[PDB]
Scaffold this motif. Structure first.
Motif, PDB file in Angstrom:
ATOM      1  N   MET A 145       0.914  -1.309  -0.044  1.00  0.00           N
ATOM      2  CA  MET A 145      -0.199  -0.012   0.002  1.00  0.00           C
ATOM      3  C   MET A 145       0.690   1.254  -0.024  1.00  0.00           C
ATOM      4  SD  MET A 145      -2.729  -1.540   2.794  1.00  0.00           S
ATOM      5  CE  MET A 145      -3.907   0.408   2.857  1.00  0.00           C
ATOM      6  N   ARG A 146       1.892   1.292   0.813  1.00  0.00           N
ATOM      7  CA  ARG A 146       2.921   2.241   0.834  1.00  0.00           C
ATOM      8  C   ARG A 146       3.596   2.412  -0.325  1.00  0.00           C
ATOM      9  NH1 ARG A 146       4.131   3.248   6.750  1.00  0.00           N
ATOM     10  NH2 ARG A 146       5.808   4.617   5.918  1.00  0.00           N
ATOM     11  N   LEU A 195       1.506   4.059  -3.129  1.00  0.00           N
ATOM     12  CA  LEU A 195       1.424   5.708  -2.809  1.00  0.00           C
ATOM     13  C   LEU A 195       2.558   6.401  -3.275  1.00  0.00           C
ATOM     14  CD1 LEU A 195      -0.311   5.448   0.503  1.00  0.00           C
ATOM     15  CD2 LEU A 195      -1.401   6.198  -1.436  1.00  0.00           C
ATOM     16  N   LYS A 196       3.783   5.665  -3.202  1.00  0.00           N
ATOM     17  CA  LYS A 196       4.944   6.141  -3.511  1.00  0.00           C
ATOM     18  C   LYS A 196       5.090   6.372  -4.806  1.00  0.00           C
ATOM     19  CE  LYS A 196       7.948   4.714   0.680  1.00  0.00           C
ATOM     20  NZ  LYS A 196       9.030   3.964   1.042  1.00  0.00           N
ATOM     21  N   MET A 243       2.465   6.686  -6.971  1.00  0.00           N
ATOM     22  CA  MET A 243       1.704   7.441  -7.588  1.00  0.00           C
ATOM     23  C   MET A 243       2.275   8.942  -7.256  1.00  0.00           C
ATOM     24  SD  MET A 243      -2.128   6.786  -6.011  1.00  0.00           S
ATOM     25  CE  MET A 243      -2.989   5.449  -6.894  1.00  0.00           C
ATOM     26  N   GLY A 244       3.082   9.146  -6.221  1.00  0.00           N
ATOM     27  CA  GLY A 244       3.998  10.417  -5.847  1.00  0.00           C
ATOM     28  C   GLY A 244       5.147  10.625  -6.949  1.00  0.00           C
ATOM     29  N   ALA A 255       5.310   9.334  -9.885  1.00  0.00           N
ATOM     30  CA  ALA A 255       4.558   9.469 -11.208  1.00  0.00           C
ATOM     31  C   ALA A 255       4.355  10.863 -11.440  1.00  0.00           C
ATOM     32  CB  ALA A 255       3.370   8.750 -11.357  1.00  0.00           C
ATOM     33  N   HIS A 256       3.720  11.621 -10.272  1.00  0.00           N
ATOM     34  CA  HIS A 256       3.229  12.893 -10.467  1.00  0.00           C
ATOM     35  C   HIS A 256       4.402  13.938 -10.391  1.00  0.00           C
ATOM     36  CE1 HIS A 256       2.304  16.613  -8.110  1.00  0.00           C
ATOM     37  NE2 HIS A 256       1.176  16.639  -9.048  1.00  0.00           N
ATOM     38  N   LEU A 267       7.813   5.514 -14.818  1.00  0.00           N
ATOM     39  CA  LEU A 267       7.434   4.181 -14.335  1.00  0.00           C
ATOM     40  C   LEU A 267       8.252   2.900 -14.712  1.00  0.00           C
ATOM     41  CD1 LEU A 267       4.619   5.575 -13.874  1.00  0.00           C
ATOM     42  CD2 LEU A 267       3.447   3.552 -14.985  1.00  0.00           C
ATOM     43  N   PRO A 277       5.457  -1.607 -12.010  1.00  0.00           N
ATOM     44  CA  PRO A 277       4.627  -0.578 -11.366  1.00  0.00           C
ATOM     45  C   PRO A 277       3.245  -1.178 -11.171  1.00  0.00           C
ATOM     46  CG  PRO A 277       6.100  -0.135 -13.378  1.00  0.00           C
ATOM     47  CD  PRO A 277       6.231  -1.573 -13.036  1.00  0.00           C
ATOM     48  N   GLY A 307       0.602   1.911  -9.719  1.00  0.00           N
ATOM     49  CA  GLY A 307       0.428   2.993 -10.004  1.00  0.00           C
ATOM     50  C   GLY A 307       0.633   3.523 -11.316  1.00  0.00           C
ATOM     51  N   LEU A 320      -3.373  12.445 -13.031  1.00  0.00           N
ATOM     52  CA  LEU A 320      -1.759  13.001 -12.421  1.00  0.00           C
ATOM     53  C   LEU A 320      -2.012  13.521 -11.420  1.00  0.00           C
ATOM     54  CD1 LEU A 320       0.107  13.210 -15.923  1.00  0.00           C
ATOM     55  CD2 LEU A 320       0.326  11.202 -14.394  1.00  0.00           C
ATOM     56  N   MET A 379      -3.278  11.889  -8.235  1.00  0.00           N
ATOM     57  CA  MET A 379      -1.978  10.946  -7.749  1.00  0.00           C
ATOM     58  C   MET A 379      -1.254  11.749  -6.914  1.00  0.00           C
ATOM     59  SD  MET A 379      -1.077   8.279 -11.033  1.00  0.00           S
ATOM     60  CE  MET A 379      -1.881   6.937 -11.467  1.00  0.00           C
ATOM     61  N   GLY A 380      -1.139  12.811  -7.312  1.00  0.00           N
ATOM     62  CA  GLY A 380      -0.131  13.788  -6.570  1.00  0.00           C
ATOM     63  C   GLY A 380      -0.842  14.254  -5.383  1.00  0.00           C
ATOM     64  N   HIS A 418      -0.755  11.286  -2.620  1.00  0.00           N
ATOM     65  CA  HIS A 418       0.388  11.049  -1.880  1.00  0.00           C
ATOM     66  C   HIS A 418       1.010  12.211  -1.230  1.00  0.00           C
ATOM     67  CE1 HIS A 418       4.983  11.701  -2.089  1.00  0.00           C
ATOM     68  NE2 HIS A 418       4.903  10.374  -1.952  1.00  0.00           N
ATOM     69  N   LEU A 426       4.969   8.859   4.654  1.00  0.00           N
ATOM     70  CA  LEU A 426       5.447   7.632   3.870  1.00  0.00           C
ATOM     71  C   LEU A 426       7.090   7.380   4.087  1.00  0.00           C
ATOM     72  CD1 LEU A 426       3.676   7.822   0.719  1.00  0.00           C
ATOM     73  CD2 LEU A 426       3.384   6.126   2.365  1.00  0.00           C
ATOM     74  N   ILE A 442       0.079   2.288   9.299  1.00  0.00           N
ATOM     75  CA  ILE A 442      -0.629   2.207   7.924  1.00  0.00           C
ATOM     76  C   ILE A 442      -1.797   2.490   7.753  1.00  0.00           C
ATOM     77  CG2 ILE A 442      -1.171  -0.424   8.206  1.00  0.00           C
ATOM     78  CD1 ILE A 442      -0.185   1.437   4.930  1.00  0.00           C
ATOM     79  N   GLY A 497      -6.767   3.855 -13.349  1.00  0.00           N
ATOM     80  CA  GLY A 497      -5.738   4.628 -13.360  1.00  0.00           C
ATOM     81  C   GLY A 497      -4.653   4.661 -14.154  1.00  0.00           C
ATOM     82  N   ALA A 501       2.310  -0.417 -18.271  1.00  0.00           N
ATOM     83  CA  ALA A 501       3.671  -0.077 -18.277  1.00  0.00           C
ATOM     84  C   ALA A 501       4.444  -0.438 -19.109  1.00  0.00           C
ATOM     85  CB  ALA A 501       4.118  -0.294 -16.808  1.00  0.00           C
TER      86      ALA A 501
END
Ligand SMILES: NC(=O)c1ccc[n+]([C@@H]2O[C@H](COP(=O)([O-])OP(=O)(O)OC[C@H]3O[C@@H](n4cnc5c(N)ncnc54)[C@H](OP(=O)(O)O)[C@@H]3O)[C@@H](O)[C@H]2O)c1
Ligand SMILES: NC(=O)c1ccc[n+]([C@@H]2O[C@H](COP(=O)([O-])OP(=O)(O)OC[C@H]3O[C@@H](n4cnc5c(N)ncnc54)[C@H](OP(=O)(O)O)[C@@H]3O)[C@@H](O)[C@H]2O)c1
Lengths: 371, 371
Positions: free
Chosen positions: A173-174, A177-178, A180-181, A183-184, A209, A222, A224, B177, B180-181, B184, B191, B198, B271, B321
């Motif tokens: 899950m972490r 999120l990472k 997604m971060g 990618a953005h 990615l 990947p 996200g 995008l 996603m930002g 995060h 994180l 969690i 997504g 991807a």
């Protein structure tokens, strides 16, 4: 006379959800909680509004033998090691487990009491002491479509799943999120610029990615911005273990041993936090009016939520974003497919951590207390 | 001498992908490209490696009716406005369109030449002047499974899709995008801290997707960290327009006007940036060995990529991807389902902007030049 319940894997993610629910429902008021550990023997246990003993050894058979009930979310590795050694020592208590280890065992029952309460009750009278939570996919599916099976209408089912990262673990899950971060962040500047070319943005995101720096330790790929069409171990028949469980666990829950219902499909990991979504092709054994089908579905249990097959309500209700953290199991897009009047389409969403894991376990615990 | 080809909608997303592909394949060597505009008359056209005239008025019937071919990615609103006026002016040139406007017209052909080249050739000989690109979902599915339809083995098909943001537009991709930002950013500190809980992270993320400040203008709902089980407008039969296009366009491409192959399912937005994924339940009308099925699939065209049904290769190859930006259309997870030997499961991934939009259009142009 108050039962001593052993809590194992409480500190873990699923266990933490279990703890949260048991606290909300005041489950600890009716039992004597004994918290076990595999790392911090003697340490402090979680607050449950009452005095508890310090953390005890989860590998100590002498400690576990004194328990009436064992409620474990520690995992399959723990169950495989401790359970046989404990039973051999003559322990005759009740074993409630989240792990898949004992699901298909002859002396165990897969528990999902809104669906198979009668199976559980009969097993309890028969002397069965092993009660195992079902796989998240199967549990969430049956919570949504229990009425159809209960009516004996299902001929077969093809399940294409959209499974959340929570099913893989906390670290996954972490990672989602990472990812997604990451990618953005690669196009953060470009997103502020309205005149920035979309193909330039897309090019940079795709490179990110695929880059080594992209956090892919836990998924191996990947998630996200993408998806992964394979969950759990590969089997010699071409199925993944996740897909294999669909038919095996569904028919055991429903006690369809003689003539099992064919259940198959593809299990896909998607970029959602903790909600599993499933798109279903359902073959019914006869032509049933759609409104009757909706009736059979919605009347099965008070947690399933029939979402009307209209656009804006489906967009708002039938999503992980709307379901996450709740015990609600919405099912929508219900309609007859073009193949024929016996072909039913359905889309359902359910929280993986609740009905797909923790909730059937604590409910099974309450059932033991009511006996 | 050299054919004068009008380019409409070259500046947009699909048009830009088209321009880049036409450049790579050196299509501009063979034509006199005449670039039109709806906003910048007399302006400068794109760099296509050769001297071009300044941008002409895309709404000038006088100029348009001098063109041998018109290749437009401008949109359905443009086609609905200009096309009737142009034909009314006696224009007998060829109309190549990305928009869905003329797809189901009797005097128009849905083009996907690796699949229906013979249909295209017969239409050309018959005098047909309108050639339209198919919906991304249908085109990508047929590029992967054309071999089965060509062999006449498909009885029906249930398609559960995992569709990217690109199908909705450039602003939707940007929104994905941004979502996603935002997701995060709400747990950025947590994180970075390994000791964080969690469930606290999950709670904040769930709260963020539900907050008003979450960018959901274009999707109407969160996509990042979630999914949306509805694409395009609602139809009276309970289908979305996207789902309706499955059976309608598949059978027209195959020129099956008599007895159409039932194609249905649920079209779900996920997504991903620009790749559509599809989980398929295929009913065959014959008993065919899996190896022979694989042969039919892989031998159909040089762009389909048969991915062996093994975990490692599927995780690496059968994903958005891996596919993004490429002309490769991998199909995997090929196996007989538990329902019976005539039930085939399949998972395929394809780029929405290439084979799903731009590529069949430039290929159709080449076909015209080879007349
Ligand atoms: O997935 P899932 O929820 O089913 O199981 P899980 O969360 O993977 O379970 C992890 C297990 O490992 C131990 N553990 C190690 N590091 C931990 C951490 N940072 N937080 C919590 N527990 C940790 C816990 O056992 P102990 O608490 O007994 O060490 C816990 O039962
Ligand atoms: C499918 O595929 C087709 C292609 O759609 P699409 O997504 O490619 O259309 P799009 O990206 O929305 O672009 C469509 C048109 O809008 C104009 N436009 C306005 N502002 C723009 C900007 N900032 N950047 C680029 N173009 C801009 C352009 O025409 P002008 O160059 O004439 O202004 C362009 O040809 C659609 O019809 C759909 O049905």
């Amino acid at each position: 006379h108050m039962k001593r319940v052993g809590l194992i894997g409480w500190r873990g993610m699923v266990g933490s959800v279990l703890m949260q629910r048991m606290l909300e429902e005041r489950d600890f008021d009716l039992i004597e909680p004994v918290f076990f550990t595999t790392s911090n023997v003697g340490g402090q246990g979680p607050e449950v509004g009452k005095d508890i003993a310090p953390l005890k050894d989860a590998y100590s058979i002498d400690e576990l033998k004194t328990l009436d009930v064992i409620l474990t979310c520690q995992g399959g590795d723990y169950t495989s090691e401790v359970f046989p050694k404990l039973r051999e020592a003559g322990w005759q208590g009740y074993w409630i487990d989240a792990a898949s280890s004992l699901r298909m065992e002859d002396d165990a029952v897969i528990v999902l009491d809104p669906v198979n309460r009668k199976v559980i009750d009969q097993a309890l009278d028969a002397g069965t002491r092993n009660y195992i939570g079902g796989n998240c996919t199967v549990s969430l599916m049956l919570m949504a479509l229990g009425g159809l099976f209960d009516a004996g209408l299902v001929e077969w089912m093809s399940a294409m799943t959209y499974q959340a990262a929570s099913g893989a673990g906390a670290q996954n899950m972490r990672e989602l999120l990472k990812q997604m971060g990451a990618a953005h962040a690669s196009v953060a500047d470009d997103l502020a610029n309205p005149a920035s070319a979309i193909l330039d943005i897309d090019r940079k995101v795709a490179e990110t990615l695929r880059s080594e720096a992209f956090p892919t330790e836990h998924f191996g790929a990947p998630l996200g911005g993408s998806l992964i069409p394979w969950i759990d171990k590969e089997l010699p028949n071409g199925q993944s273990r996740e897909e294999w469980k669909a038919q095996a666990e569904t028919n055991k829950i429903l006690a369809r041993f003689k003539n099992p219902i064919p259940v198959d499909g593809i299990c896909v990991r998607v970029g959602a936090m903790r909600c599993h979504s499933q798109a279903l092709t359902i073959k019914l054994n006869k032509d049933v009016p759609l409104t009757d089908i909706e009736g059979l579905i919605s009347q099965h249990n008070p947690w399933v939520k029939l979402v009307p097959n209209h656009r804006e309500v489906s967009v708002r209700e039938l999503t992980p974003a709307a379901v996450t953290g709740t015990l609600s199991v919405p099912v929508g897009r219900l309609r007859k497919l073009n193949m024929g009047s016996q072909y039913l389409g359905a889309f359902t969403v359910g929280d993986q951590l609740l009905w797909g894991a923790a909730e059937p376990l604590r409910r099974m615990l309450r059932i033991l207390l009511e006996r």
